Design a protein around this ligand. Structure first.
Ligand SMILES: Nc1nc2c(ncn2[C@@H]2O[C@H](COP(=O)(O)OP(=O)(O)OP(=O)(O)O)[C@@H](O)[C@H]2O)c(=O)[nH]1
Ligand SMILES: COc1cc(-c2ccnc3cc(-c4ccc5c(ccn5C)c4)nn23)cc(OC)c1OC
Ligand SMILES: Nc1ncnc2c1ncn2[C@@H]1O[C@H](COP(=O)(O)OP(=O)(O)CP(=O)(O)O)[C@@H](O)[C@H]1O
Ligand SMILES: Nc1nc2c(ncn2[C@@H]2O[C@H](COP(=O)(O)OP(=O)(O)O)[C@@H](O)[C@H]2O)c(=O)[nH]1
Ligand SMILES: [Ca+2]
Ligand SMILES: [Ca+2]
Ligand SMILES: [Ca+2]
Ligand SMILES: [Cl-]
Ligand SMILES: [Mg+2]
Ligand SMILES: [Mg+2]
Ligand SMILES: [Mg+2]
Ligand SMILES: [Mg+2]
Lengths: 351, 440, 424, 54
């Protein structure tokens, strides 16, 4: 009888893993601060990694990788990509991004940022940007506007190139993003969940008024709120992969695998292999797994762009059941024994 | 040459002291009766080994050590043991009633009645010192004597020898190695009163030493003799530069200069490799690269913690055996590329290296195989604060209910010393997090 | 080091005699006090319970107390009767009539100073006395009333030694008289105040064990005392045999007692034996020793939470297996150990097994479930006291009803204190 | 990677390699504290002996 504790009540996905585990009849939940657990489903903030792996006679496992937040905070990720030789400043799948500290706080790139802007305006290039942080987003061609706005707010912001030429689904002439769920187990196997989702805009994309941000922001929250046509084409403004595949076959004569998924698997693999030496628990006295949400954009040339990585994602309603069963299968029962829904991401090219 | 006095307090400090002096004798060629044939300057000297041994007219080489236990059974085994002749009776000090795992009983009650006798015995050793640098203090955190008496001794040594340096070797408590239920209390209390009196302190988590002994020595249930011979190797690694010719860490002050830039953050992590079983039939010797790499595996540290999630303030490699500078730099080069080694911004990213060509000596019949090269890394990383987090949490659980508190007040301690000590530790954890974390 | 042992009253002397018979046989010492063993481990800690005599004979540091001479004459007549220092037989003639008041205030007061004189002579011959252990019952008059008077006097004269008792709790299933709840309630208050650790031995539990699992249809006091002897040998192993744990009660007291009044321990033994040959495995020892059916206090551990636990394994066995099994009852039943005392289970081992077994385990629980014992005594007390029944036996020796009201108030307080930590 | 302050002797060598440059109470206060605890003990003992005398 394995033992576990729950320290995030507000997590849709690990609530279901909690119940799935009880139903085995071989897992018993302890109280929050009982230290004699096998498994910790821990808090989002200030998870006490320093207290794991010190209980004699207990293999211990937590559902978070210590250090994985350098992938999962906007400013961190930018700094990680620019500084890590495996990703490089010359990184083809990440949008141009610059970290910007507000002036109250006074590292920061804001004047090497305008180098690029000035280069671009004198270059007659498309020159929309987007400022963002880790709801408070500004899309503007006015650089002199953008650094205005960052400093009115008090936390650090990322300025990133805006994807002016996105792939738009028809009918709708409308934007979307792709969310992938990836599970990294204690062995640092990288598992892509076979089902993703497209979070679609229900507004036609208009490239001349970025001041209105509902055809520009595909967040499920904003679409159910502000936009006239939520639910119009897709249930919950969520398109799944079988549909998006068929559309690509009919509309563009390709498939999801060739045109988009190869790129996505390469981005996932590259991100997680980059931080693997910093967060691996291979020789550690406790063990980690974690579920990530990767968010990609597709431009009209079917090039895939990573926009962010989410360290504590929620699932799509229809997929909770299958994903959560899969987390128990490969993350938990792998360590505590009682056709796969994941694609193992491994590549060993010789050079 | 400047002399160093070793002070061993309580059971843990005495038994580890015996391991250390056994090893030292084997390393310097001193026999159990104190004779050192190779010492050609008979009855005197100022060689490097003289910092730890004094000499008598007859040619006896005598540890600059005092043993102190509040009950006799542990030091009696010194008095009757195979190194009986090594020590002067005046250096072995025993009470008759111990501190019963109670910090307050060792500090206040039993301490008051023996502290002056100990300082007088300590003074007899200081008086045969042309130039004393200070003290090496061996004790457990969890014992009543090792915690309570030691902190009283540390306070008085600050008074009676204020310009001297004081280093500690402190066994941190682990439930796997027999443990009183109030050892978290004792730990926090003695850390709080010793913090300003100690210039540098090497913590040894009995949990890490235990697991090294099971995993690398194939000892399924390690004894204190197993644990202490390993600890003794590590301590010997750390002190060898005071006992041997060289130019790194040549006096106690250099330990603080080289390892402790911030004086409160004075807890260097020790990592040691390789530990090889003497029962291992076929063993292939490990290289300079391989043993230096092993310095960055947590399974080899004296305190299990994760240095990737902290920052370094200093780092020394002490090698013993067949090691030459260019292999160290080649090994360091390859390691910086494959490993998370981040320093605080105001320190250089660099390694002070010391090589002594004599490989580690092993106690005959011990558990450690002889090796051709070994290294002990001393890194002052903020990741060691994990051990304070663990201790403090356990302290918090018990003190919320005042469990066992009545035992301390009964010795004359005031409850408020508990919360004072816990508040100091609260500051220390935040210092560590200031230095070693940048904001999320 | 040295412990001075006292046994008071009928039950105190019968169990105390059989304790000294059992452990003297362990240590090789024969009925004339002459050693005859084959190991030096038998004599390394022999000084804790024995004085060395002229001729290096071993004499128990044991004082034998009663207000009548009957039982002690049976002891002097008994198997090991001559092992005892004759000067240490201290007895009155009148008895205490199962009357706490006679034990504590009248008959016993007359005898107590002479008991303290023998205590003092045994203390002075001690290199470094650590404290005292008393065996007595709480349901009669001598062990209950005089025993607690002695405990009070001894604390006055030695306030810094450890006081330790093995106290037999009365039960209507093994009952001599109706006034036992009165005697026991009066005694319990003394124990809360003036001992450091009390082993609660419930005659209820000893009966059920003898009946339900030893299959003894008509258990005698002899059967009950077999169990008590075996348990007493087990809890005193560290006091009598070499080990990594030395022989001192203070350290045990410090690690078992988080709050001074809650020092009432539920003992247990495995395998439960009547006076077989099957090998008991380490997993079996461990499962049994924690089994409610092996507890000598008729309380259900699952009704409370363990504050602290001490466990003592005897025999040749794998401590790796011992460590494993201990870790797995605590990891598999972590509900029943308070989370606010980390690592509150301690395990000791001793190579030497008791007579007739190759492997035994002794359990020592400080559980809040022990309140059930005190509630039970309290309900029996109250059922008589609300009618002032049988009080005249006590008022006739000078006691007032107020002192009864105070004693039950004290025991109900102790019960509330246990309850407070079962919910904390 | 600079290798500096090399020192040799017959026992061994030492040096420093740099990957990258930077970016007490009185005796009387103690004996007082020890005596204040001692009187807290002797008080509590007097409270016990007073209680025992009652
Ligand atoms: N590594 C190691 N730890 C020890 C040793 N002896 C005791 N310890 C540990 O120290 C703690 C107990 O402290 P002790 O040194 O035995 O206590 P003490 O200082 O003698 O004080 P009292 O016995 O309370 O008077 C426990 O955590 C032990 O595991 C030893 O020889 N080696
Ligand atoms: C004289 O009798 C005995 C003495 C000791 C004993 C001697 C020396 N030191 C200690 C330390 C603990 C001890 C006790 C309980 C503990 C811990 C840690 C957690 N918990 C709950 C430590 N016990 N002990 C031990 C015995 O058996 C367990 C004895 O017999 C019952
Ligand atoms: N450089 C960029 N170019 C084009 N669109 C972008 C963009 N950056 C963000 N977006 C759009 O903004 C939306 C969300 O931005 P953001 O990166 O902050 O996600 P989010 O953290 O707010 C919610 P979640 O964490 O679930 O993804 C994306 O879905 C995308 O539609
Ligand atoms: N287990 C056990 N209980 C006893 C024994 N003798 C008496 N008892 C119980 O002790 C209580 C009576 O106490 P007793 O010792 O005879 O009175 P005292 O002689 O005045 O101290 C009752 O609970 C009896 O059941 C005995 O030998 N063994
Ligand atoms: Ca010389
Ligand atoms: Ca100082
Ligand atoms: Ca009379
Ligand atoms: Cl000085
Ligand atoms: Mg986000
Ligand atoms: Mg001791
Ligand atoms: Mg009777
Ligand atoms: Mg008199």
């Amino acid at each position: 009888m394995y033992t576990f504790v729950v320290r995030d009540e507000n997590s849709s996905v690990y609530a279901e893993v909690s119940r799935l585990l009880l139903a085995t009849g071989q897992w018993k939940r302890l109280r929050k601060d009982n230290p004699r657990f096998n498994l910790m489903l821990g808090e989002r903030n200030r998870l006490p990694f320093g207290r794991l792996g010190h209980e004699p006679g207990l293999v211990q496992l937590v559902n978070y990788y210590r250090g994985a937040d350098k992938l999962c905070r906007k400013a961190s990720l930018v700094k990680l990509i620019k500084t890590s030789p495996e990703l490089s400043e010359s990184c083809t799948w990440f949008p141009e991004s610059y970290v910007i500290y507000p002036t109250n706080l006074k590292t920061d790139e804001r004047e090497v940022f305008l180098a690029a802007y000035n280069r671009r305006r004198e270059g007659r290039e498309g020159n929309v940007w987007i400022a963002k942080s880790s709801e408070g987003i500004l899309i503007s061609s006015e650089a002199s506007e953008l650094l205005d706005f960052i400093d009115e707010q008090g936390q650090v912001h990322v300025i990133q190139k805006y994807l002016e030429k996105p792939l738009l689904l028809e009918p709708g002439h409308r934007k979307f993003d792709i969310r992938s769920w990836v599970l990294v187990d204690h062995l640092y196997n990288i598992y892509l969940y076979r089902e993703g989702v497209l979070r679609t805009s229900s507004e036609p994309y208009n490239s001349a008024n970025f001041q209105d941000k509902t055809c520009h922001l595909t967040n499920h929250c904003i679409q159910k709120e502000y936009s006239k046509n939520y639910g119009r084409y897709e249930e919950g403004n969520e398109m799944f992969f079988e549909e998006f595949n068929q559309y690509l076959m009919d509309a563009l004569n390709t498939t999801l695998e060739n045109s988009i998924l190869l790129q996505i698997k390469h981005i996932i693999r590259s991100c997680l292999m980059c931080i693997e030496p910093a967060i691996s628990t291979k020789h550690l006295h406790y063990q980690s797994f974690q579920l990530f949400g990767f968010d990609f954009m597709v431009d009209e040339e079917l090039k895939v762009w990573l926009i962010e990585v989410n360290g504590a994602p929620a699932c799509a309603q229809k997929l909770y059941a299958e994903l959560c069963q899969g987390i128990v299968d490969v993350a938990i029962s792998s360590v505590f024994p009682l056709t796969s829904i994941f694609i193992k991401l491994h590549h060993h090219h010789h050079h | 040459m400047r002399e160093c006095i070793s002070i061993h307090v309580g059971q843990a400090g005495v038994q580890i002291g015996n391991a250390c002096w056994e090893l030292y004798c084997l390393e310097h060629g001193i026999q159990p009766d104190g004779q050192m044939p190779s010492d050609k300057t008979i009855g005197g000297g100022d060689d490097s080994f003289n910092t730890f041994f004094s000499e008598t007219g007859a040619g006896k080489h005598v540890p600059r050590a005092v043993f102190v236990d509040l009950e006799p059974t542990v030091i009696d085994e010194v008095r009757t043991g195979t190194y009986r002749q090594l020590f002067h009776p005046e250096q072995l000090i025993t009470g008759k009633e111990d501190a019963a795992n109670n910090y307050a009983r060792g500090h206040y009650t039993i301490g008051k009645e023996i502290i002056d006798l100990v300082l007088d015995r300590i003074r007899k050793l200081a008086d045969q010192c042309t130039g004393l640098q200070g003290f090496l203090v061996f004790h457990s955190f969890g014992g009543g004597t090792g915690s309570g008496f030691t902190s009283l001794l540390m306070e008085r040594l600050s008074v009676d020898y204020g310009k001297k340096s004081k280093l500690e070797f402190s066994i941190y408590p682990a439930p796997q190695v027999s443990t009183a239920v109030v050892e978290p209390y004792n730990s926090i209390l003695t850390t709080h009163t010793t913090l300003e009196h100690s210039d540098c302190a090497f913590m040894v988590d009995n949990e890490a030493i235990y697991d090294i002994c099971r995993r690398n020595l194939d000892i399924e249930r390690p004894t204190y003799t197993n644990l202490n011979r390993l600890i003794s190797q590590i301590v010997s690694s750390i002190t060898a530069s005071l006992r041997f010719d060289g130019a790194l860490n040549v006096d106690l002050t250099e330990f603080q200069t080289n390892l402790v830039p911030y004086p409160r953050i004075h807890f260097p992590l020790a990592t040691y490799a390789p530990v090889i079983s003497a029962e291992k039939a076929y063993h292939e010797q490990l290289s300079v690269a391989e043993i230096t790499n092993a310095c960055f595996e947590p399974a080899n540290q004296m305190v299990k913690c994760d240095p990737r999630h902290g920052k370094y303030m200093a780092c020394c490699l002490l090698y013993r055996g067949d090691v030459v500078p260019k292999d160290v730099n080649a090994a360091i080069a390859t390691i910086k590329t494959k490993r998370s080694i981040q320093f605080v911004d105001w320190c250089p990213t660099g390694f002070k290296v010391g090589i002594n060509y004599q490989p580690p000596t092993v106690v005959p019949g011990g558990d450690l195989a002889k090796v051709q090269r070994a290294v002990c890394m001393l890194s002052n990383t903020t990741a060691i604060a994990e051990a304070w987090a663990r201790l403090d949490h356990k302290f918090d659980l018990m003190y919320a209910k005042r469990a066992f508190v009545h035992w301390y007040v009964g010795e004359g301690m005031e409850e408020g010393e508990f919360s004072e000590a816990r508040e100091d530790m609260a500051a220390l954890e935040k210092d560590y997090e200031e230095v070693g974390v940048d904001s999320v | 080091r040295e412990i001075v042992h006292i046994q008071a009253g009928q039950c105190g002397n019968q169990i105390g005699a059989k304790f000294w018979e059992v452990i003297s046989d362990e240590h090789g010492i024969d009925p004339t006090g002459s050693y005859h063993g084959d190991s030096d481990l038998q004599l390394e800690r022999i000084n804790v319970y024995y004085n060395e005599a002229t001729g290096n004979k071993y004499v128990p540091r044991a004082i034998l107390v009663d207000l009548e001479p009957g039982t002690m004459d049976s002891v002097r007549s008994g198997p090991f009767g001559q092992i005892f220092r004759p000067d240490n037989f201290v007895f009155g003639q009148s008895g205490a009539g199962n009357n706490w008041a006679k034990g504590h205030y009248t008959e016993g007061a007359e005898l107590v100073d002479s008991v303290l004189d023998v205590v003092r002579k045994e203390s002075e011959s001690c290199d470094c006395l650590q404290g005292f252990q008393l065996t007595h019952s709480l349901g009669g008059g001598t062990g209950s009333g005089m025993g607690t008077l002695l405990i009070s006097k001894i604390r006055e004269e030695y306030p810094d030694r450890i006081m330790n008792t093995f106290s037999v709790m009365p039960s209507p299933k093994v009952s001599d008289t109706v006034v036992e709840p009165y005697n026991a309630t009066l005694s319990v208050h003394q124990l809360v105040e003036n001992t450091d650790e009390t082993y609660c031995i419930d005659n209820e539990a000893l009966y059920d064990i003898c009946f339900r699992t030893l299959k003894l249809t008509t258990p005698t006091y002899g059967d009950l005392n077999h169990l008590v002897s075996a348990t007493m040998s087990g809890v005193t192993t560290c006091l009598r045999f070499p080990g990594q744990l030395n022989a001192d009660l203070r350290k045990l007291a410090v690690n078992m007692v988080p709050f001074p009044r809650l020092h009432f321990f539920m003992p247990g033994f495995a395998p439960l034996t009547s006076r077989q040959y099957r090998a008991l495995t380490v997993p079996e020892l461990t499962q049994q020793m924690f089994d409610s059916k092996n507890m000598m206090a008729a309380c259900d551990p699952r009704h409370g939470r363990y504050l602290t636990v001490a466990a003592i394994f005897r025999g040749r066995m794998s401590m790796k297996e011992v460590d494993e099994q201990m870790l797995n009852v605590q990891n598999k039943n972590s509900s029943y150990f308070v989370e606010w005392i980390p690592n509150n289970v301690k395990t000791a081992v001793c190579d030497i097994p008791p007579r007739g077994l190759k492997m035994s385990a002794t359990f020592i629980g400080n559980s809040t479930a022990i309140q059930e014992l005190f509630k039970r005594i309290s309900e029996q007390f109250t059922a008589m006291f609300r009618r002032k029944a049988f009080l005249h036996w006590y008022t006739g020796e000078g006691m007032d009803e107020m002192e009864f009201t105070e004693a039950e108030s004290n025991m109900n307080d102790l019960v509330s204190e246990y309850q407070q930590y079962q919910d904390a | 990677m600079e290798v500096i302050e090399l020192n040799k002797c017959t026992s061994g060598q030492s040096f420093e390699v740099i990957l990258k440059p930077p970016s007490d109470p009185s005796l009387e206060e103690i004996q007082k504290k020890l005596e204040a605890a001692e009187e807290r003990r002797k008080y509590q003992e007097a409270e016990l002996l007073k209680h025992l005398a009652e």
